[PDB]
UniProtKB/Swiss-Prot annotation, chain A:
Mutagenesis or variant effect for residue 114 to G: Significantly decreases affinity for its own mRNA
Shown residues in whole-protein numbering: 3 to 152 of 179
Name listed for the protein in its UniProt record: Small ribosomal subunit protein uS7
Main function: One of the primary rRNA binding proteins, it binds directly to 16S rRNA where it nucleates assembly of the head domain of the 30S subunit. Is located at the subunit interface close to the decoding center, where it has been shown to contact mRNA. Has been shown to contact tRNA in both the P and E sites; it probably blocks exit of the E site tRNA.
Organism listed in the record: Escherichia coli (strain K12)
Quaternary data: Part of the 30S ribosomal subunit. Contacts proteins S9 and S11. Cross-links to IF3 and the P and E site tRNAs.
UniProtKB/Swiss-Prot annotation, chain B:
Composition-biased stretches (Basic residues): 43-51
Assembly with partners or alone: Part of the 30S ribosomal subunit. In stalled ribosomes contacts ribosome rescue factor SmrB.
Shown chain mapped onto the complete sequence: 4 to 54 of 71
Family assignment from sequence similarity: Belongs to the bacterial ribosomal protein bS21 family.
Protein name: Small ribosomal subunit protein bS21
GO molecular function, one term: structural constituent of ribosome
Native organism: Escherichia coli (strain K12)
Swiss-Prot record, chain C:
Subunit comment: Part of the 30S ribosomal subunit. Interacts with proteins uS7 and bS18. Cross-links to IF-3. In stalled ribosomes contacts ribosome rescue factor SmrB.
Included stretch of the parent chain: 71 to 129 of 129
Protein task: Located on the platform of the 30S subunit, it bridges several disparate RNA helices of the 16S rRNA. Forms part of the Shine-Dalgarno cleft in the 70S ribosome.
Listed name of the protein: Small ribosomal subunit protein uS11
Gene transcribed to yield this protein: rpsK
Note: Has been predicted to contact the N-terminal domain of IF-3 based on footprint studies; exactly how IF-3 interacts with the 30S subunit is controversial.
Family: Belongs to the universal ribosomal protein uS11 family.
Disulfide cysteine pairs (residue numbers): none
Organism from which the protein derives: Escherichia coli (strain K12)
Amino acid sequence: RRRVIGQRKILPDPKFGSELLAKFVNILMVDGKKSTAESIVYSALETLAQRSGKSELEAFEVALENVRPTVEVKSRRVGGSTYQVPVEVRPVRRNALAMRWIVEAARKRGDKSMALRLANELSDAAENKGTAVKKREDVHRMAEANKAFA
Amino acid sequence: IKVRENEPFDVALRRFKRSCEKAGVLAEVRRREFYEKPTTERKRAKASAVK
Amino acid sequence: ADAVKEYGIKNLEVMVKGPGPGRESTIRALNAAGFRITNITDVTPIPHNGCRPPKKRRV
RNA sequence: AAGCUUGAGUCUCGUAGAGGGGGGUAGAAUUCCAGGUGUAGCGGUGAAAUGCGUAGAGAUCUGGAGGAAUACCGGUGGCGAAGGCGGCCCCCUGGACGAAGACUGACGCUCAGGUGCGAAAGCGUGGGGAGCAAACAGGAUUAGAUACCCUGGUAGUCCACGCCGUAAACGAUGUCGACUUGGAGGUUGUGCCCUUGAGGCGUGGCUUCCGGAGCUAACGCGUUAAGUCGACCGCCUGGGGAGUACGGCCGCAAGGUUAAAACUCAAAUGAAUUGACGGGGGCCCGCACAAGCGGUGGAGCAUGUGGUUUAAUUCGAUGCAAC
RNA sequence: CUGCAUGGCUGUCGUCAGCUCGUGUUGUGAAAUGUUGGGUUAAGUCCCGCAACGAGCGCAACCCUUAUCCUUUGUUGCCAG
RNA sequence: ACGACCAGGGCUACACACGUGCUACAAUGGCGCAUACAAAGAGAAGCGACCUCGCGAGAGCAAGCGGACCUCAUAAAGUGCGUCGUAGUCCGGAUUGGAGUCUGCAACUCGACUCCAUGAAGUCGGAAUCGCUAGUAAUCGUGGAUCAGAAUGCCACGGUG
RNA sequence: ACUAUGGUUUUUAUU
């Protein structure tokens, strides 16, 4: 409406030289407790560099041009009917969303520590056969992957 | 209303703008306009209808 | 277009009638059959004949 | 009782057009007939089912059959007293109009009772029967559904000789004549011109909207008048009932014709202004949504209106604005 | 006892962009117009059409205050030397 | 007396369910130790330090300042160590019980506090459904008025974010 | 071209 503003000022991390990794301490993080997520920065990533890039400083950033969207579909309503309209992702949001759900299922399980549940999520980041795939496959799920509503 | 290259701008009078519908060109309605000017125009059009 | 492979069609001319939603994908699925579709004509009414048709009622 | 041409009427050569019949001239698909092509669903709905299907329902070709109906062109364009009239040609025919001359000589107007006309519907008899369709029977949805929606389907829809004259029969304006001001846009003759303009300028017949004056409560009417005036006819005199009731007529008949009152209200009626609102026609904002993310009511606590209740469970508050 | 008499408070639309009035204008008139159209805004905000041009309440002005700079006081507050 | 003193009932009675809040069903959890940093209020029958004793509450001795100085007062979450590998659990708290500690005219009834004994239901919830903006939301700490005593209501102040 | 179903509410002073 009349607000719209927008955007937030962000920097690369002072300790890691990454504009991506400073977002990762806001993921798998609760009640503002970034310190509990810093305990699993690079330390848990030695298990993940075994299958992604070389060294902890690129083991996620190589996948940056896959873990982000470029096209979606959006649900809109007219009278008694509902319609699924294809959309293109805007430049600031197309640059974003890389880690927003990439470790969603590490939250609660009862099996293994956080440093192990992190690696058991990032192992499916470029494969999409494991847990919570409905959170990352959704963008084509009213497009190419199902044509019955059209 | 729009005809030919216009587009790239500008060729004056601008009647593709402020449209929207209804009650346009009202400063060329009731008195003063027309007289014989549409007669000479349409006579030359009929002189150009031949064959 | 799979039910006609034994006829060996090469050049194909297309006619399109009526306003309905299936009027475009039917031309890409027909291109995907290996025919030259450089002629496509739209013949949608502009209504004629229909006896009259009868109409009446309002709007 | 004789004239007049000025109202009424007539003749030449010409003119536009869905005016009224009958005979000709053609096609479409749903349908029907036969032989081919050829198939798993078809139809409908927010969603379905009744129904119709592999025995080909559904779809379709080829040559034949049949019933309703006529796109285009067609125009804020015509015909006429209304109601009506729109594929196209012909024969027969009603109405209206032009150029220039020639005629009758007031032959005109209105009307009780008569006389003559009907869109659609209802009806007598004989044809008609594709697609729809009252009635009627089922499938929905509804605490109804008997209806809107869906599937079927008789009368009807059409033709013809007739019966009954109805209406929002509408511009709600009885019929006729006359005088009163302008504009834009259609429409058809004709004089003079081989139009050599794809027509100009005079001048008859028609014609849709605007609107200076006049009327009106306001809408409306407007030189095409509800304006200004005469000629002839019929119409009301307060509502509520009601062209209903009683009687004859005319029809096979529903009806049509002239047309109340006991009782009941001491009243109703017309126009559009400001609120109030919409399940309207439009525009603009809000976590009202979208998208993201974290909760609530089930268990066990803290606690209070209302309800139960001892001996009082004080009064007051029960919509957004109480607990 | 009861705001269904009142001093005086207080609920909600809502803190919405809206409501009136002088001197005119419109209509037979009660009244309406001015404030409905146009470009725009947080908004009757600002402008143009236009029978209006203006005024008061709401809004806004006005006034405070925050992010910068400048200045006065220093133990029991503070502690570069 | 529809005026109101004393003395008891009550308004914390329960033959109905419910609304708002709280806390669990736990493993970025819970318990027990180590380690690191505050803001704002309160103080004359005052705030009560420190020290000793009592499973402890608290009691006794008793400082300093009537408060920018003295006091209420080890801020908590965060970090690190130890641990269960998902069990009705080292989970969970209602009830049935004990023995002390404090105030007060008086606490059986209709209070608080402490240390201990029993330890249910509950495995994330009908038809469904609440909310939202930037030092904010989230979450974990602190203080205060009503008091002789006494809230999960009421009103306010920091960290991390 | 396109959603299909909302019945019921029993009253008063403009001091």
